[PDB]
Amino acid sequence: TSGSIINHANNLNKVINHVFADKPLISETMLKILTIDGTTGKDGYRNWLD
Amino acid sequence: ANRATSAFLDNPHPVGVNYVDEGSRQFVAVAELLASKLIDSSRESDESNSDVPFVQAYSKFADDNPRHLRVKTGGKMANALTNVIRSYYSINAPAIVPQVEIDRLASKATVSGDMYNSYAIFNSVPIVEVLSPARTTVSIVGSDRADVTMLNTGAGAANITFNFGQIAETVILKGSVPFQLARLNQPMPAARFTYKLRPLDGPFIVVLPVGNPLVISATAATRIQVPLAFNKALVESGFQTAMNDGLFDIQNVNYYSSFDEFIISQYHAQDGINRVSTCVILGLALQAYDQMRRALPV
Amino acid sequence: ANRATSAFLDNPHPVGVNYVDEGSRQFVAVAELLASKLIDSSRESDESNSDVPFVQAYSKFADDNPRHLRVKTGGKMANALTNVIRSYYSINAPAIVPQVEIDRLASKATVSGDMYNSYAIFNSVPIVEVLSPARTTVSIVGSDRADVTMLNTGAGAANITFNFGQIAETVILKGSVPFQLARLNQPMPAARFTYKLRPLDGPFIVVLPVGNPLVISATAATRIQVPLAFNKALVESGFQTAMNDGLFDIQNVNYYSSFDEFIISQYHAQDGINRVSTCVILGLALQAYDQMRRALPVR
Amino acid sequence: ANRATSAFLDNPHPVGVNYVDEGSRQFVAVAELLASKLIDSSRESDESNSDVPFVQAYSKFADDNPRHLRVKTGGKMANALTNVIRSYYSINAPAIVPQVEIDRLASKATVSGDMYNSYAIFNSVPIVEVLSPARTTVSIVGSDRADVTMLNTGAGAANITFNFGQIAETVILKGSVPFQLARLNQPMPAARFTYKLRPLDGPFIVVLPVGNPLVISATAATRIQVPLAFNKALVESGFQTAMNDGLFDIQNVNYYSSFDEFIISQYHAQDGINRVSTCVILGLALQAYDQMRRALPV
Amino acid sequence: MDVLSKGSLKELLAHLEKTPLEEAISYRIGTVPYQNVLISRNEYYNQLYPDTTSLIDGVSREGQRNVNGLIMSIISYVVSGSGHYIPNIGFMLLRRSILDILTKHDTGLVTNNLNYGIIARNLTVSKMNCEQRKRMLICFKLLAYKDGNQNDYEIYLNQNIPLKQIAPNFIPGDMRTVIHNQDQLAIVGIPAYRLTQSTELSIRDDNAKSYKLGYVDWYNSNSFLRERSEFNLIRLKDRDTKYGKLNGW
Amino acid sequence: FLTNTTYDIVNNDTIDVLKMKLRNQGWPFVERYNAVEIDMSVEPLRSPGQ
């Protein structure tokens, strides 16, 4: 349903913004693995959480 | 001549006339919805190894947090649900629940309260009258399956009249041996095991030959409008639970083996369509009673 | 000798031979899945005080948007399901649903047409025949629980032969008073209240003493392969609904009080292995019918 | 004097004395929970086009990834569950699965081993004895609904004593014709079609007039403490599957038509309370057996 | 569906040339043709709705094993979209095109004994609409030309006044007559009126509306061939040509 | 491109024949995939909903 997809997309962005704010929840070692393909750290974490 | 009638069709007691308005119908629907969540939350609490899902469900239902040293009774909603069940059964019940209390409990969730969104099939067989001539004995046993045993002692074959009322939708007749049945002023057909009948099509005549007894097994189906949340399995459990708890113990009332017999008997009483609406709301309340009491035994 | 048989086992009418292929089996499964969504959406509409969930599910089921002043009946999908149900019951019922309509409706939802994933238990008691001597009387009543009343008026004890068929798995016999039962050419055991029997063991002999009548209560259980979505409560409710609406009113057909009686009666007839496959599809169709009418009622 | 008794109440066999500890009760609770998810994962898998929900459910249950070209029996959990059902039914059945294996399978999910939180209603009618005078014939047929057919061929009216035991909570008596019933050493009331009785009140006396036979239909309701996950529909299906699969076939045992007859018969035995406790654990195991076997038919 | 969409004589005969006989024959058992039955129409009535089944319904029926049943199955396919159950005809006959059966002696099928009046009555010509009668008359003319029964075809038209007025004008051996013909033979098509997802009372009308609604879905489906946008992707052998001639015409 | 032929050579080949040629060479992408229908609703507000 469109409502479920819209709700999930907005909630996913809100969580990602909060986890990366201030001191990031996940370490730099994980970000290196997720960014090895050229994607940004925020983008790599968002896909993996999904 | 002799007359035989079903035991459960005799003398339906008057039902209550209270808590049948729109506001009270919503409260019964609210109780059913919140009672179902109590059962589901208890299953979730057991699986997740956390009491947090149960605490939320109990707080919504009982307006108070669960406590280890206080008995879990369901709060004021449980008392109101118990009292309305007593009122529905008989007109002699007290019916003491205030309107302000009922209205505030219907605001806990949003439900339509409509009791005509769906239908349910009731299996009780209504034999209003079996008319038999002399030298013949007729016995009627059972409600969900009615067995009619007839003996012909006289010299010749006898005609037996069957009346199934004007409410039941269909009636199936099965015999131990092939037999002849036809409507009034109709030729008799060849003997066969099974007959399908419409009760509105007048009385039915059965030819009883002399000799071994003939036993007829009767099954009937009747459709009564019920709300969409109606569940016959849960209503039946609540009806048995309410009798054992004493909720139906009032003076000058009749007792039935099941909610199937209760609703059909009230339907067949004079001006019985008045009572059938109240009986459906009682069935929904019993559905809430079964789920709530199973989750919070006392 | 006198012969007595169960009423519901007598003369099973032939079942239909149409709409039994994979494409039609998919259509019935699709209808059952969509009917379940219809009944759940109506519950959600009640809880949300909004008609959006129900209109959303009715559009998928009926391929049409509900409009006021027009009765909601289920659209073309209801027309196909109701008429296919009639064809399954009897071979005299016409086949009037085109293949183009079946294929289109079967593509609405993804689902398997498998009708042999799971099993179910049916409680009808098959008593094919009871053979008794001259001076005895035997009466059989009931289908779910069969009570056989036997009275002996002769000088000595009589032997009654019980035939329970070959299809039922187990039969439990309970007597009003202790009685003796044994297989053919086997010494009689001591009097007992209850007997657990295998119908394949053969005809069973019961000693009926002279005196008060002896009543034997019979319960049976049989296993039939059914799809996983099968629900006995929903199938039975649909069977009574189809009877009330008159879909089963066809010429030269036999009427049964329950779907349990109907499926067992067809099983015990000749070529019953082929008949029981058609009955299973009918049961799933009746489950879809029951959920569809309860969502869209008519006074 | 003649004595008549219900068939299913006669000679209850001893039940098993193993797998009744806290760790064993947890295993049955785990088996029911994981088997329920197996039946639900099958429906979710069919709705979508992925077998992932079933693969996760089967892997947890069977401790092995499902593979094609294999029967998918159920793993060690299915084997252990089958053997404990055998042990519960009879004290003669061996106890095969070790306690270490039971504890290992109980750690797969975190669920409470309590089996007496909720209750359930059982409708078997326990007619322990019917005492009749010399010139009267009495016959008792049925368990769920008990029909007592009595005929008086004597000169005068006869008094018949009914004993319903002390376990049943309520008993509803319906007659083919109105009849008189009263307690011991009590006056008889006017003829009535129906009676509601508490079996603990005492033995009851029924007046049997001379003439046509009188048939009384009895219905009972007894409440038994069970886990909250208890479902009567699932338990009865598992009982039939258990008997059909031939795991109740042990020397010197009694066989029953339903689980309801089994549990009421044990309740009326010598150590009724202790026997029922084991049977309730058997009921939950049978419920898990039904769900597991319907998903994985072998 | 595809056969019902053809709206000109040229398209109808072109489709019959490329369509084998096995498409006319159905392998579903169906039911016996002429029976008084009660069907369910819940959109209109609560009681069962009487009707009589027929061979020109859209649902397969059981057919006679004789040559009469084979021709009657071909015509029902053309006018109703489905044929009848005549099994074990044979590979040699089933692989031939519908036009070859109706027009060519080399098939090995003998049809000179056929009676057009009996065939029309068995097909319920009275229940047919104008397009359906025109399509059946095309089949009759092709059969008459194959058997040298042109005179008999004309006399049968003289006996039936309504059939003579709507009789299509083409010589079954000349392609110039087919191109000139402007008769509209379409049974399904894009509807100018309002078409709703509603049931019809009779079996024939309800089954016809299913094809009409199915054709609309087929028109917007990916299987439909859009000549305006994808003419170059069509193979040259089956590409539309102005100088399109049936073999031997 | 992959099987080393020309358009004229494969002009009369059918879909199943073309699928076999590519699959033998080792190319698995020879199938069309049906999309998933997402159900959508517009909240009514002033106008009736869609």
Short mmCIF file of N, CA and C in Angstrom, two decimals, chain D residues 19 27 31 61-62 73-87 96-98 101-102 104-105 247 289 292-293 296 298:
data_model
loop_
_atom_site.label_atom_id
_atom_site.label_comp_id
_atom_site.label_asym_id
_atom_site.label_seq_id
_atom_site.Cartn_x
_atom_site.Cartn_y
_atom_site.Cartn_z
N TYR D 19 7.58 -36.86 32.28
CA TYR D 19 7.51 -35.62 31.50
C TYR D 19 6.48 -34.65 32.08
N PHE D 27 8.92 -27.64 27.40
CA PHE D 27 9.09 -28.23 26.08
C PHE D 27 7.77 -28.30 25.33
N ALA D 31 6.85 -26.34 21.98
CA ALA D 31 6.41 -27.07 20.80
C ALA D 31 5.11 -26.49 20.25
N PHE D 61 12.08 -24.67 14.08
CA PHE D 61 11.42 -25.86 14.63
C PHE D 61 12.31 -27.09 14.51
N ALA D 62 12.89 -27.32 13.34
CA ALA D 62 13.56 -28.58 13.04
C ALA D 62 15.07 -28.52 13.19
N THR D 73 10.29 -34.14 7.80
CA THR D 73 9.59 -34.77 8.91
C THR D 73 9.33 -33.79 10.05
N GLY D 74 10.32 -32.97 10.39
CA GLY D 74 10.17 -32.05 11.50
C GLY D 74 11.37 -32.03 12.43
N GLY D 75 12.34 -32.91 12.17
CA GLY D 75 13.55 -32.91 12.96
C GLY D 75 13.39 -33.63 14.29
N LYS D 76 14.27 -33.29 15.22
CA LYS D 76 14.26 -33.93 16.53
C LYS D 76 13.08 -33.47 17.37
N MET D 77 12.56 -32.26 17.13
CA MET D 77 11.40 -31.80 17.87
C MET D 77 10.17 -32.65 17.56
N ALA D 78 9.97 -32.99 16.29
CA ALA D 78 8.84 -33.83 15.92
C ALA D 78 8.95 -35.21 16.56
N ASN D 79 10.15 -35.78 16.56
CA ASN D 79 10.35 -37.09 17.17
C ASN D 79 10.11 -37.04 18.67
N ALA D 80 10.66 -36.02 19.35
CA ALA D 80 10.49 -35.92 20.79
C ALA D 80 9.03 -35.69 21.17
N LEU D 81 8.33 -34.86 20.41
CA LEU D 81 6.92 -34.59 20.70
C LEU D 81 6.07 -35.85 20.54
N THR D 82 6.38 -36.66 19.53
CA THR D 82 5.61 -37.89 19.31
C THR D 82 5.77 -38.86 20.47
N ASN D 83 6.98 -38.98 21.01
CA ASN D 83 7.22 -39.96 22.07
C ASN D 83 6.59 -39.55 23.39
N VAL D 84 6.56 -38.25 23.70
CA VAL D 84 5.98 -37.83 24.97
C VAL D 84 4.47 -38.02 24.97
N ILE D 85 3.82 -37.91 23.81
CA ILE D 85 2.38 -38.17 23.73
C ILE D 85 2.09 -39.63 24.05
N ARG D 86 2.96 -40.54 23.59
CA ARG D 86 2.80 -41.95 23.93
C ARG D 86 2.92 -42.18 25.43
N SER D 87 3.89 -41.53 26.07
CA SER D 87 4.13 -41.74 27.49
C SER D 87 2.97 -41.21 28.33
N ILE D 96 11.16 -42.63 26.37
CA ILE D 96 12.32 -42.81 25.50
C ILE D 96 13.22 -41.58 25.49
N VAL D 97 12.64 -40.40 25.29
CA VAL D 97 13.46 -39.20 25.10
C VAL D 97 14.14 -38.83 26.42
N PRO D 98 15.45 -38.62 26.43
CA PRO D 98 16.14 -38.28 27.68
C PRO D 98 15.80 -36.87 28.14
N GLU D 101 17.72 -34.11 26.29
CA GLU D 101 17.13 -33.71 25.02
C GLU D 101 15.92 -32.81 25.22
N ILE D 102 15.11 -33.08 26.24
CA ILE D 102 13.95 -32.24 26.52
C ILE D 102 14.40 -30.83 26.89
N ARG D 104 17.21 -29.30 26.11
CA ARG D 104 17.80 -28.61 24.97
C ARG D 104 16.74 -28.04 24.05
N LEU D 105 15.67 -28.80 23.81
CA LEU D 105 14.59 -28.31 22.96
C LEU D 105 13.73 -27.27 23.66
N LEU D 247 -0.38 -44.16 17.86
CA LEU D 247 0.52 -43.97 18.98
C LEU D 247 -0.20 -44.07 20.32
N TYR D 289 0.74 -31.28 18.08
CA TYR D 289 0.82 -32.36 17.11
C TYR D 289 -0.05 -32.08 15.89
N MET D 292 1.57 -29.21 13.72
CA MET D 292 2.80 -29.65 13.07
C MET D 292 2.51 -30.64 11.95
N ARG D 293 1.58 -31.57 12.17
CA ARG D 293 1.33 -32.61 11.18
C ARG D 293 0.57 -32.08 9.97
N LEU D 296 3.25 -30.50 7.88
CA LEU D 296 4.24 -31.46 7.41
C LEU D 296 3.62 -32.85 7.40
N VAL D 298 3.40 -36.57 6.57
CA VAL D 298 4.31 -37.63 6.18
C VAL D 298 3.57 -38.95 6.08
#
